[PDB]
From a paper:
Cyclodipeptide synthases (CDPSs) use aminoacylated tRNA (aa-tRNA) substrates to form peptide bonds between two amino acids yielding a cyclic dipeptide product (CDP). ParaCDPS from Parabacteroides sp. ParcuCDPS belongs to the XYP sub-group of the CDPS family, characterised by the presence of 3 residues: X40 where X is a non-conserved residue, Y202, and P203 (numbering respective to AlbC). ParcuCDPS displays a Rossman-fold common throughout the CDPS family.
We solved the crystal structure of ParcuCDPS at a resolution of 1.90 Å (9 residues out of the total 230 were not traceable), uncovering unique characteristics of histidine substrate selection. The structure was solved by iodide SAD phasing after extensive failed trials of molecular replacement, suggesting substantial deviation from previously determined CDPS structures. The active site includes the four conserved residues previously identified: S26, Y167, E171 and Y191. β3 holds another important deviation seen in ParcuCDPS’ structure, as it changes direction (compared to common CDPS fold) at I56 to divide the active site pocket. This structural change of β3 facilitates the placement of D58 into H-bonding distance of the active site S26. From these calculations, P1 is predicted to be mostly neutral apart from Tyr55 and Glu174 which form a negatively charged microenvironment, while P2 is predicted to be mostly lined by positively charged residues.
Author numbering: 1 to 60, 70 to 230
Write the structure that this text describes.
Amino acid sequence: MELHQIRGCHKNDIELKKYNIGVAISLGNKWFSIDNIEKLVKWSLLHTKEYVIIYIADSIKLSDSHAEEVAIRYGRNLFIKIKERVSLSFSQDEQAKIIYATWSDIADSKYKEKVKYLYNLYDKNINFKNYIENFVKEWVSKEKRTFNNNEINKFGRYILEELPELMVQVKARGVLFEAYVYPYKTRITEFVGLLQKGEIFPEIKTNILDNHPKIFLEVRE
């Protein structure tokens, strides 16, 4: 498990341990075994400025929020398994560095304003809508299962709920994490890169981004 590639800072910034580090779990993504999650947490604990923040980054009716429904249906059980593994593999003083951040811990008033900006843009701007929708379609085209165009549209909205967390530096339980680790570059991480640079949908950068962009750390075996 090692750093393969870096967006948002230089390699030295990491070795100087400048930043707190989030571990961004894609729940239901088959790479995110408990074993692989534990190895990302191990790596992040050895490179972090202080804290490691574990959270659910994406999900690819008991709540109005899809991320919240995923948090209560599946995220809580995942977090319990992770904690158990951690308490058996790490020392007490290492365990004190780890923060388990639920959707609620991240989606505060300021965060939700950003999501709401994106929802309104999804509704008023048909170029944005179609870009997000074609976005869902390409990933589903890699799946055997099929989806109707109303499901495609609903999945797009779900992406918008997590987009600010990938784009901007947010706090979990009061702790800023400037960087996050993820094992591979994806179409979503490339999209966020352009968004942060104002090279796609520049209105988004104007309206919800803050000149402190989320650093992406590509970490895999």
